[PDB]
A paper describes a structure:
Ku binds dsDNA by a preformed ring but C16 sterically blocks this access route, abrogating binding to a dsDNA end and its insertion into DNA-PK, thereby averting signalling into the downstream innate immunity system.
Out of 579,038 initial particles for the C16–Ku complex, 170,770 resulted in a map for the C16-C–Ku complex where, although the estimated average resolution was similar to the full complex, structural features were better defined. Here, the cryoEM map for the C16-C–Ku complex shows clear volumes corresponding to the Ku heterodimer, and the presence of two copies of the C-terminal domains from the vaccinia C16 protein to form a dimer without ambiguity. The C16 dimer binds as a single unit at one end of the central channel of the Ku heterodimer interacting exclusively with the Ku80 subunit. The two C16 subunits are stacked on top of each other so that the lower C16 interacts with the side and top rim of the core β-barrel domain of Ku80 that forms the base of the Ku DNA-binding channel, while the upper C16 is held over the top of the β-barrel and directed towards the large hole defined by the bridge structure that sits over the channel and forms part of the Ku heterodimer interface. The lower C16 has a substantially hydrophobic interface with Ku80, with side chains of Tyr197, Leu198, Phe246, Leu252, Phe253, Thr312, Pro314 from C16 forming a curved hydrophobic groove into which the side chains of Val 2, Ile245, His246 and Pro248 of Ku80 protrude. However, supported by its dimer interaction with the lower C16, it projects an intensely negatively charged plug formed by a helix-turn-helix motif from residues 233-255 into the mouth of the bridge.
Residue numbers in the entry:
A (entry chain A): 33 to 534
B (entry chain C): 159 to 331
C (entry chain B): -1 to 176, 181 to 189, 193 to 544
D (entry chain D): 162 to 331
The structure:
């Protein structure tokens, strides 16, 4: 396990090229752009998965066993520059033209053969399996409504693939008259027992919605740790800790041999200056110099002076949410979810605690020790209710926010300041400015400029092309538009506030 | 005229070589380097030898000169600094070091030619010559030095200041 | 981020009572002498092991001898100056530990205050000090004269000397009084004598004269001093301001200074790995050997370190890159408003970074203060926040963050916290627990959990004034790691042939909630244990 | 033997040297390395043998010469010029930890003397020519200077200095 496999299955029928509204993207272009975005995300995150793009409904074919109307554009391999370049070549109006020219659209297909080809693609991989997943990008809800023999074979093959271990997922796009899953699917797609019976994604009509749905349902959640939440010494339940936010760093360079470019796997050794031999871990000590005094301790005691409590979460009490201050932020929050695989019955107690904490508007003050020999921090478990948007995408998971609370040592002093108030007229003018400069904020509305520039340069270099073209930063304010929107309010505010001499 | 700019160090019975201050025809530069107090630096003195190709050789440290026997050759002064002065385990695979003015520690703006070879002591009088050079540089380090700046790409990036005493010479062939 | 401070020191005189009555024993509470020793030891350990430049003097009163420069015969008797103004060291710590003994006499604490004032006045002539402080550790169980009081107050005001008072008891009003007694935890007006009441009245009036109503906040008990940073309150320094201009557009600029409000405190010194016998670093040579990924053992020179980058399944070497090719040219240091948005749109779970900034107007700028006040009040009235771009300098990576108003009775400012980028978000999906039939709690379980939550409340609506009181404020508690480390270091410095001592009891007491919550929990906890079966997996 | 010559008037010309050899005045063209406390990028000063500094240019030309700002040391010029905030002296003090001067290194500074100040249009033209010449050479030839502010931890300001030594006629 550890190397997930994902196959992108894109329909190539005629309906995937009608755009209706002239200002809306073609569903085919939506699919291509979503796949290319997934590739970019995988390379940026440096995540080693296997991805494949397959088209069905074409006249040309490239699959191993020469079935009809199944082209394997890309097999299972790590993402790279040339695959993304080819997908970009399929993008747009000219991309659609060249796609149709090189792989015609509109033909008879059978879903059983498509799923068989995908299963063969999964089998052909040598570097283990872990999670196997297929995604359908279609806008036809009844593909074999006129051939019951094909439909039964399709259901049988889908059941066989699901039994093998492959997870089938649907990415149904906007269709005139709505998309109905209950017609043909719900007998093919994978349903996670009773937890995922209802609450299915709605049909996608815009690129961002489809991208969010694709990213939400292919990323396996990895837990940082699996701690124990103890109400007291007896009642202990098992929880998982997650990092829903994490700073994205620019990958450091790797060392490669001149003879063959490959990782080196560096090692560290301890050597003695005089003897020139290896040093045992018990043949050295730790020192600290204070003024002119040397304080000597062994490694075990250095670890022992940091040991307070066993790892886990210890409940200290319950505190009203109004007592938590927004300006006391210390370090990024974590997420706490129940774990049933370690302690049985943890989920029921977790659910009851969440329900009652939400009802009473209270947070659980706890003591937090991540691992062994670490001094504790005080944390607040703030209850968090599940929230879905109009596309039924989970924008807020149910569980607990682990909020780190500062110590007295982390609170710094402010200098003395004389309070100067502003007259109501100045406040009114600034209110007018604020109203004229209003927008809507989303958590995913800005991109890191340094990372984007770095990866654009790397992409240009890996393709052996010339210098790329710099892009305008999206975190830099648009001063001109702001000035036109504000008008003479700035001048009037300056007249009221700023003295003429300064 | 009580000051001196060019000195002579005797190598053997017949050939005594010259130590200059300016790079007006020399090929090898010895740098005696001192680092002021910092919260990420624990090594104070490092001596290096730099050619016109930018290749650098570790010569001496706080433990003396017997480290030239190890023959530690790197391709840049920043690499030597990260290898030796930044021996911290966290700081090893952490960041890099660079000069924002494109100025070398020995040749300033002068272009670096393609690497040809690296001078390295082979004889026994070579160690004596290197010891004499190190002693002469250390004798003049309290009043003759220049400032050098390197930038570490930390968060936020930091600036490291070095006191460098430079001596230019040609080793006879 | 790091804290940068101005570089000013302070002179601190610790006036300690060692008299007869400050040694009494009681079955359950330590003597005031021992608690004062603990507080003084805490202060000095922090000063010594942080390597501050503050100078500390120690003046004992109630001693059996007399070593003060104002003796003159039958005046200011039984007052010793045990340590003059100098940097603290381990000799002072050893003296506090096992060289200073309780006395058998009594001294007026006003005379001791006069002696401490004389120490400050005559021992600071040749040096520079931004702050002069006196901390008094007494029990107020001695007769005193009221004659020199006005001169004392006038001298304190003229010379700009601050005062803090530490007593065995608290200054609470209508506390209501209340298993084993615990020191340093969060949870006695009739237990004090008349002389203590008179001393308390004099102390209160001196504190009111010196500062005002807020001066009563500066009388502490020995118990709460060990669980607070109160002894360092008048020698703390704020960081050097970050100066910039908040820009709304290309025509509105406000001169601002930003200070660090929250920043994690970390240990300044690491451990140096030294040889077991020589105890020197020079005998250890640490080297990195990668050689080859296979079992060949071939010598590898450092000339082969060319390195390269990875773009998925391909490698781009450093031979094809340039230093100037890959560098985001920042436009410079900036604090620019991208715009304004509703407060509910910016949530706490998306806060990132390792600092919080407080933004005030630039010093000595009336127009900037008025403009910033207008912005803050406009944001507060409309319930809005500012999304801003923040760049520390021309080299730091640009950030996007949120500035929200902060209005208090004595100051108003903006608060800046970093916000995430697109690449920093992980979109996971979790199963709903409310809509789960397998994990649906019953009514009885919900009632039991409700009882537990009601019984473990750490807040109280006292006085029926719609005021909510915190019974366990953890943001006023110091980090126990620093005290534990200092204690262990001092024990190793003074007792080389002994093992490290266990954690002090008051550290444990200050890390735990008041005992009033424990049993109130114990009953519903027992109720819950039966209703919820928790069986560990036996894989 | 003069390293460079600048025309002063019809009669006399002024010699500019790169070394201090019997020279009274030194013009320093200074570029300040990026610091979060510094709001000014480049400046230019004239320093005499007593350490007195007259400010010449502030990246807007020689127009600030007419203000006649004279400081007792280069640290004072930095305190009163390159900081946006008001009371810079209240926060820290600037000095060189090796007792080096920006113009004379570890030499002995003379007693307080009057600083040369331009009066006539010939002087203004000469300073304009000198500033243009110094700006031309700044990209190739310069040295590093360091000032230290007594903060905890100490603050370090790095300067890139191009120096030209010369004398004025009596």
């Amino acid at each position: 396990s550890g190397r997930d496999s994902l196959i992108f299955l894109v329909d190539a029928s005629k309906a995937m090229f009608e755009s209706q509204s002239e200002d809306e993207l073609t569903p085919f272009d939506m699919s291509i752009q979503c796949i290319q975005s997934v590739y970019i995300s995988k390379i940026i995150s440096s995540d080693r998965d296997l991805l494949a793009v397959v088209f069905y409904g074409t006249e040309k074919d490239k699959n191993s066993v020469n079935f009809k109307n199944i082209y394997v554009l890309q097999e299972l391999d790590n993402p790279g520059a040339k695959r993304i370049l080819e997908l970009d070549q399929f993008k747009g109006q000219q991309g659609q033209k060249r796609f149709q020219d090189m792989m015609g659209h509109g033909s008879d297909y059978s879903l059983s053969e498509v799923l068989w080809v995908c299963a063969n693609l999964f089998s052909d991989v040598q570097f283990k399996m872990s999670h196997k997943r297929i995604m359908l990008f279609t806008n036809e809800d009844n593909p074999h409504g006129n051939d019951s023999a094909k439909a039964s074979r399709a259901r049988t093959k889908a059941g066989d693939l699901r039994d093998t271990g492959i997870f089938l997922d649907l990415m149904h796009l906007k269709k005139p008259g709505g998309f109905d899953i209950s017609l043909f699917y719900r007998d093919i797609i994978s349903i996670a027992e009773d937890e995922d019976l209802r609450v299915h994604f709605e049909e996608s009509s815009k690129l961002e919605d489809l991208l969010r749905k694709v990213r939400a349902k292919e990323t396996r959640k990895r837990a940082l740790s699996r701690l124990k939440l103890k109400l007291n010494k007896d009642i202990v339940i098992s929880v998982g800790i997650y990092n829903l936010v994490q700073k994205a760093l620019k990958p450091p360079p790797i060392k490669l041999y001149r003879e063959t470019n490959e990782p080196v796997k560096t090692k560290t050794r301890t050597f003695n200056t005089s003897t020139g031999g290896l040093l045992l871990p018990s043949d050295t000590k730790r020192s600290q110099i204070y003024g002119s005094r040397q304080i000597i301790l062994e490694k075990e005691e250095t670890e022992e002076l940091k040991r307070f409590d066993d790892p886990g979460l210890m409940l200290m009490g319950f505190k009203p949410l109004v007592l938590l201050k927004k300006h006391h932020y210390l370090r990024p929050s974590l997420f706490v979810y129940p774990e049933e695989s370690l302690v049985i019955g943890s989920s029921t107690l977790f659910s009851a605690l969440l329900i009652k904490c939400l009802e009473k508007e209270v947070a659980a003050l706890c003591r937090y020790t991540p691992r062994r020999n670490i001094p504790p921090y005080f944390v607040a478990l703030v209850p968090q209710e599940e929230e879905l948007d109009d596309q039924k995408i989970q924008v807020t998971p149910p569980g607990f926010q682990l909020v780190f609370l500062p110590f007295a040592d982390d609170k710094r002093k402010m200098p003395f300041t004389e309070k100067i108030m502003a007259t109501p007229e100045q406040v009114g003018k600034m209110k007018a400015i604020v109203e004229k400069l209003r927008f809507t904020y989303r958590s995913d509305s800005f991109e890191n400029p340094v990372l984007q520039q770095h990866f654009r340069n790397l992409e240009a270099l890996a393709l052996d092309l010339m210098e790329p073209e710099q892009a305008v930063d999206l975190t830099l304010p648009k001063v001109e538009a702001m000035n036109k929107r504000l008008g003479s309010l700035v001048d009037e505010f300056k007249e009221l506030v700023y003295p003429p001499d300064y | 005229s009580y000051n001196r700019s060019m000195t002579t160090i005797h190598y053997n019975d017949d050939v005594d070589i010259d130590i200059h201050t300016d790079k007006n025809g020399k090929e090898l530069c010895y740098c005696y380097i001192t680092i002021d107090d910092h919260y990420l630096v624990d090594v104070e003195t490092i001596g290096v030898i730099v050619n016109r190709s930018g290749k650098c050789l570790l010569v001496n440290n706080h433990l003396g000169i017997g480290i030239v026997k190890d023959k530690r050759i790197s391709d840049s002064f920043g690499d030597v600094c990260m290898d030796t002065i930044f021996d911290f385990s966290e700081a090893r695979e952490l960041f890099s070091l660079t000069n924002d003015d494109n100025r070398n520690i020995a040749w300033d703006t002068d272009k670096l030619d393609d690497d040809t070879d690296i001078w390295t002591p082979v004889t026994e009088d070579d160690y004596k010559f290197l010891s004499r050079l190190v002693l002469y540089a250390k004798s003049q380090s309290d009043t003759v030095f220049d400032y050098y700046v390197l930038t570490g790409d930390t968060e936020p990036p930091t600036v490291f200041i070095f006191k460098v005493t430079r001596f230019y010479f040609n080793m006879p062939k | 981020p790091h804290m940068v401070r101005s570089g000013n020191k302070a002179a601190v005189v610790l006036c300690m009572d060692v008299g007869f009555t400050m040694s009494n024993s009681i079955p359950g509470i330590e003597s005031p002498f021992e608690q004062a020793k603990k507080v003084i030891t805490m202060f000095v350990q922090r000063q010594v092991f942080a390597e501050n430049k503050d100078e500390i003097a120690l003046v004992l009163f109630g001693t059996d001898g007399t070593d003060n420069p104002l003796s003159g015969g039958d005046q200011y008797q039984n007052i010793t100056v045990h340590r003059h103004l100098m940097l603290p060291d381990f000799d002072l710590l050893e003296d506090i530990e096992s060289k200073i003994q309780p006395g058998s006499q009594q001294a007026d604490f006003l005379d001791a205050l006069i002696v401490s004032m004389d120490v400050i006045q005559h021992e600071t002539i040749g040096k520079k000090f931004e702050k002069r402080h006196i901390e008094i550790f007494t029990d107020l169980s001695s007769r005193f004269s009221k004659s020199q009081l006005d001169i004392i107050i006038h001298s304190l005001k003229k010379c700009d000397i601050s005062l803090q008072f530490f007593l065995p008891f608290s200054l609470g009003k209508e506390d209501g009084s209340g298993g084993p007694f615990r020191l340093g935890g969060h949870g006695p007006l009739k237990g004090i004598t008349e002389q203590q009441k008179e001393g308390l009245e004099i102390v209160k009036m001196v504190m009111i004269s010196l500062e005002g109503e807020d001066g009563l906040d500066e009388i502490y008990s020995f118990s709460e001093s060990l669980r607070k940073l109160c002894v360092f309150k008048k020698i703390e320094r704020h960081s050097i301001h970050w100066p910039c201009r908040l820009t709304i557009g290309s025509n509105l600029s406000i001169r601002i200074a930003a200070y660090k409000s929250i920043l994690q405190e970390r240990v300044k010194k690491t451990w140096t790995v030294v040889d077991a016998k020589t105890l020197k670093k020079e005998d250890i040579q640490k080297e990195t050997v990668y050689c080859l990924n296979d079992d060949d053992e071939t010598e590898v020179l450092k000339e082969d370190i060319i390195q390269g980058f990875r773009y998925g399944s391909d490698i781009v070497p450093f031979s094809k890159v340039d230093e100037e090719q890959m560098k985001y040219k920042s436009e410079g240091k900036c604090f620019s408003v991208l715009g304004f948005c509703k407060s509910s749109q910016v949530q706490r779970r998306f806060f990132m970074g390792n600092q919080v900034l407080k933004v005030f107007a630039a010093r000595d700028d009336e127009a900037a203060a008025v403009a910033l006040s207008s912005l803050i009040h406009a944001l507060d009235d409309l319930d809005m926040v500012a999304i801003v771009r923040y760049a520390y300098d021309k080299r730091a990576n640009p950030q996007v963050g949120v500035a929200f108003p902060h209005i208090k009775h004595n100051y108003e400012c903006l608060v800046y916290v970093q916000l995430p980028f697109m690449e920093d978000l992980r979109q996971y999906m979790f199963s709903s627990l409310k809509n789960s039939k397998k994990y649906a709690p019953t009514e009885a379980q919900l009632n039991a959990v409700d009882a537990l939550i009601d019984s473990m409340s750490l807040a109280k609506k006292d006085e029926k004034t719609d005021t909510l009181e915190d019974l366990f404020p953890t943001t006023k508690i110091p980090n126990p790691r620093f005290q534990r480390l200092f204690q262990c270091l001092l024990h190793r410095a003074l007792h080389p042939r002994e093992p490290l001592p266990p954690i002090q009891q008051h550290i444990w007491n200050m890390l735990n909630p008041p005992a009033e919550v424990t049993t109130k929990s114990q009953i519903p906890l027992s109720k819950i244990k039966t209703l919820f079966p928790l069986i560990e997996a036996k894989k």
